[PDB]
Design a binder for this molecule. Sequence first.
Ligand SMILES: [Zn+2]
Ligand SMILES: [Zn+2]
Lengths: 249, 249, 822, 242
Amino acid sequence: MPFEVVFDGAKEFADLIATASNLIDEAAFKFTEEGISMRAMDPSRVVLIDLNLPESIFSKYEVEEPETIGINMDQFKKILKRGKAKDTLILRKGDENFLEITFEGTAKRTFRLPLIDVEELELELPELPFTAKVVLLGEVLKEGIKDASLVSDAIKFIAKENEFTMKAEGETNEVEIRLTLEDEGLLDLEVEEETKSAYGIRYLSDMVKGIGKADEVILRFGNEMPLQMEYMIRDEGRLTFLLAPRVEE
Amino acid sequence: MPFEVVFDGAKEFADLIATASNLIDEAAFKFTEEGISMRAMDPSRVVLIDLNLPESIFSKYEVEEPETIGINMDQFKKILKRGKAKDTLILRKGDENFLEITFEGTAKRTFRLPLIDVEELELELPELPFTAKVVLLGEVLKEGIKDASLVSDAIKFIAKENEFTMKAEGETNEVEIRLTLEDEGLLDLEVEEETKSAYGIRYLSDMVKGIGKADEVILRFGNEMPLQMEYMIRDEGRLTFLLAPRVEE
Amino acid sequence: APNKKYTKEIIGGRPLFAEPSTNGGFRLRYGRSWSVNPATMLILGCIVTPATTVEGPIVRLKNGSVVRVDDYETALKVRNEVDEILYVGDALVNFGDFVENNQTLLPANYVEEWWVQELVQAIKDLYEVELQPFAENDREAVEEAAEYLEVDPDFLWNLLKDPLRVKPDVETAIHLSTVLDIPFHPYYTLYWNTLQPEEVEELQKALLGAQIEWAEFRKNRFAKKVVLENDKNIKRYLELLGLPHRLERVEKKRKVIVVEYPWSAALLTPLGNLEWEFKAKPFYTVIDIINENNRIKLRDRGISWIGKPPVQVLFPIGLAGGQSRDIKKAAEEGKTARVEIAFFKCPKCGHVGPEHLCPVCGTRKELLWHCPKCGADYPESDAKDFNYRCPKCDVELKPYAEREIKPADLLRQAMDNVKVYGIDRLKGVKGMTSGYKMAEPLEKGLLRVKNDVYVFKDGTIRFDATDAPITHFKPKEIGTSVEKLRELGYTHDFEGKPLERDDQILELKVQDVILPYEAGRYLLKVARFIDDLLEKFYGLPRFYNAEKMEDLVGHLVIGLAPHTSAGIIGRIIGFSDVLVGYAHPYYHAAKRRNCDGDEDAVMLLLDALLNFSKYYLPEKRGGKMDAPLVVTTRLDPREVDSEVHNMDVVRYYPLEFYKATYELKSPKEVKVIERVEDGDMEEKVARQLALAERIRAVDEHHVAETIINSHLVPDLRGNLRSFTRQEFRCVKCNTKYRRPPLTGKCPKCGGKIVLTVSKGAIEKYLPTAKMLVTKYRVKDYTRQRICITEKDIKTLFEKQRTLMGFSADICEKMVKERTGHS
Amino acid sequence: PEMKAYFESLQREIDRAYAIARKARAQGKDPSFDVEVPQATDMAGRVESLVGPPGVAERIRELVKEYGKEIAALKVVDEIIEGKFGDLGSKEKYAEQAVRTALAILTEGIVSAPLEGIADVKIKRNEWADGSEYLALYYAGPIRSSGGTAQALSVLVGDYVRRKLGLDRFKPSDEHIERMVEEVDLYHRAVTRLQYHPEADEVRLAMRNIPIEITGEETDKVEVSHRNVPGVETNHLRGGAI
DNA sequence: TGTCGTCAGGATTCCAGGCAGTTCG
DNA sequence: CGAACTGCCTGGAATCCTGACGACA
Ligand SMILES: [Zn+2]
Ligand SMILES: [Zn+2]
């Protein structure tokens, strides 16, 4: 139960947990000898967020025993609003339900909070054949989704051999973006067959606005199977969103 | 009663007037041969905001008769909000019930405004002997007061030898800030006993919205004594906030 | 009558949620002419009334022990660690209530006052000792009584002063009971009126199989403590008895209970220290069997079971103001206004305007008359000379006319009149209900706006307040000093003794006010506005000169209830700390209680004298009241005839009716009566917490309700009717209601048209019924649930689904169950 | 004892406030020159300020304090109908004033029902069956919560003034009783919940027992099945009379 | 006459990219 | 002699208390 994690500057982790809170409120961080893990489902059982951070991310990391703790997303969002980019985040926990967040600098800050428990059921996602993989930049996808957000909500991604297309249909508007290997927004392609699927972009737009511009993304999808967008944190941690498309035309 | 003030640093004057006005409306300006004094008053009658600006800071400070005039700086904040950093300001008053504001950086901007009349009695500050004198800058107190306001409603100040602790207490989460010699922003302090006081942020986070950075803020208080928070600019201009101790026993 | 009342109580609140442990009734304390202890309200549906000076209920905590609620501190301490509610407490209902429709007599109880009255009467007729009960006794009488009863004279004095406060020890109680064979002590008498003697036999067996230690006092072979094991018998009635015991766990046994004195003797001495043998006999209650197998007869204790728009100023703008109708906005825009208003005319200056006095000159302008049909104008003299008839148009001469005016430039007059320009938000009226549609002081309206107070459509300033009279009055509670009452005019107490003690129980004064801090602050703001206006209107010195909360105590205010055209004048003597208050039976009569409103509006005399005008009353229709036309202050309650009847009302217990209560007497016996007289979050949380506390009280055993369906089915029908009607309204074109046929946009306003969806309420009410049907299973409503869910589904026609679904739903479960059963 | 002196001091302060208000209103900056809220002397003053007439206070006090309030009000209404203090208009106006004064006296002058809730009272004849009479009681807004006791007392005083005037018994027609029971069931089932669920036979017995017919006013825009009923100006719902 | 939902709306603070001042081969 | 690296600061936008509306009992 007791642990201590010290890191000089955690604005990335702050905005990450802010996006997780905007996604869902009930979340439990499992602390194991390897690091931290979290898996948040959806109240409408349509979206799944997963994150893992090993012990090669923060500066100081001392854990006693692997367990599962819970932190309120509202109480955390009421905490990250004071995180300076040049601060030293220190998360301390003992045996009692007291969580300490410490910051060292021009004034020693220390906030104590109660620790409630979360009992969300965890189940391993079954393996599914992707048949479509691609690695792109985050800024291009973010600006495309922000340009196609106001016209409609169903954005259609089509992928063929060395070809990608992001389109936005409708009745009084149409948007189209082409992507090839010699373009300025595609890093690499691993397409297998001709796939095409339309997805909603509310949670998409929120989660891609929460992520910075220089970060990269890896999309895995198929014909009509759910999409998985993954990315890496400091080349050590992993974070993946997963959500199914719509059946309509 | 005619007088005139030609000043350079209109941006500094405007932000200082806004900071004096961010707290509360009432403000009696006293024009004297020794300088410009000001006593700002509130309906709560708990906080008195007395500033003094001498002739050394003013570029051209010409007086003919010392007089007091009561104004609310809320309606006057519209004109001083707009303005560059390097310019010339001229505040003139004559025998008529009008005030002339000349703005000249590179062109002419004259403003003839009416003179409102508010009736209030000047109350002298209680110069009680204290046992705690701590000097700092504005950023630390700004952060602490904003954290207390957005977290809870009660706060307790405890001063000991080279140790200034402020415990913001509420119901769920509890904040604490520590000030020691390691903080380069914190200056020396005169403290002989463990001075304890209690405050709230019901009317404290206002002036924070106007607190700058290059202004040395000294605070004098004792064991549950009225806090005299004076702050100096350019080693010549002074502005003190005298507040009664909102303590609970 | 009691069964009929219990059945008719189903018309309101969640039905079929009665506690099986304690019967559905409160205590009966006969008083001349309801009140429940606030401890039950803190531990927690009808009209409420506070009574804090009495005892409270008894419950059990999380530790397993049982304790009773006594005072506010302990109530607030244990108001969160409760496990199950056993008893409801001892609330007071009286006999002087004007109840009709053959309300039968509620069974009374053996009270301590009646008990000690019987005791003193018995000792008086036996040992020939005269005494005066219900008060402090005389020296010689109390001395001879103490000598006869082996008690202390000061203790007897304190007992006669207050028997509930000064409770005697059970040892001396049984000692004095052994001399007269009087019934048992009620306060230390459990409720046994709901147990079977066959189960009582097992109780005595478990008591014999337990541990017991004794202690005796003055030839009374009573006891000292009983240690029992909770597994020796069924703990159902052992917990339903409602006795404070102590629980112990680490004693070589899982559940151990211990009852010490003065709580173990209260259960052992009625059983005769387990000396005689108990037997089961039908048609004879446990108390009857006890009185049979004992030389002492007892009585019963628990037998009484009874059961927008927020307009501020009056400025007619109509559509010229649109929706907000901001005079500042209108002045900035510089637009006209077509109003049907009455204009004035000055004989000297000649200016025309809707104001009363002409501010340009020093006189007041007169009112001109105009025929709206024709184009003629005539003054009041010509109007009264021409018999109020115009030769051009044969219409009655009306003072007002319909024409255009420019408040944009007309506002400068009011500005220079008020001389103060402190205003942030201020709007005028939209419609006029009066026939003459007279004006309103714009200066007073601007002053009210700058004071930032509320107002109704009446035309004056009145604020709501809730009060409830009580039988006594205490300066300690009302917050007034002895010297303050002396300089007020009080020189003696309710018994003639001088006023020296702050805790002096007094009779309820007529002109006293227990009024909350919010009402006090509103009255302070009203007085500030009043002094400002009287210093800015005519230059009058401040009469009240009130600037603090305590300075208002002493002046006079006026109360008024709906359907009451007369304002009751009261004096400002008192205050309040709680959100409620108290009143007087004369200030609050039946016409002010059953008048479609319990609260009453308060006002100041100067406010009425300065802002009251009959022209503020509508022509034909009217609100909850007409107008505070006349003040009234004289309510002489038989001064020279029945002053004793008016004064002698508090703290009397009729021994005659207490003895003659179990004989099925007629409650309508006027002779005996005269003889004895002589959003969503708060509501949802409250409903869920009420259900939870009812479940804790009934020990997790309940059924479904009916008012949920009585709210849902009309909601569904109204929702369907609104969806089939679809009456729209243009946004800026606020008056022109657009037809349900869509024409794209409003032809007079090229924008969206606000529609009446009315679908957000049912979408939020559905989870309530879902959680209710998930917690409790009931029939006859799963059809309604599936119908409303499918209605929402096919009105929207859940378009996305993953490979792993399995959405848990008791609705789908019951649907599949019924499908398989079909 | 000293309570009389305390009330005298209270009325002295009230008179001081009244003199202050009069000195203020002496300038005349409002269309009003007299005191709008005067102090009542007794129930006689209350009923005189409510409906008047201004000067029957002496007779009211004499009758009440000499013979009891009930027969006092009875004789007062008798005198008002007979016109002892003079004439005030027509017989309909006399009956209206008598009913209003009687109701204000029996209610002690607290309820404004006869003041504004019941606007006018007229007598109308039956031009269909035999020429009997009905009270056209033009009501108003503030009558929907007039109070059950006040409504019963108004019915009593109406029957009393009808017996005084000597009118004929109205013949309850089939269409009249049908529309009455229709309005009753409509108000009970759709308009608003009722405090006492009535019965068809009971309301029929009541409508047959009322000697002269009663015709109220309009309440809401709800029609009936039998359109154009003789006697009523429209076919709306008389929920107020119900 | 009490309650409950929706909508827009303008005033507010927070975030981000352009204008400006500044130390590096 | 040019290029990143900040302050900062003002535009753009998300948030929200207030002011309209309709629904039931
Ligand atoms: Zn004039
Ligand atoms: Zn005419």
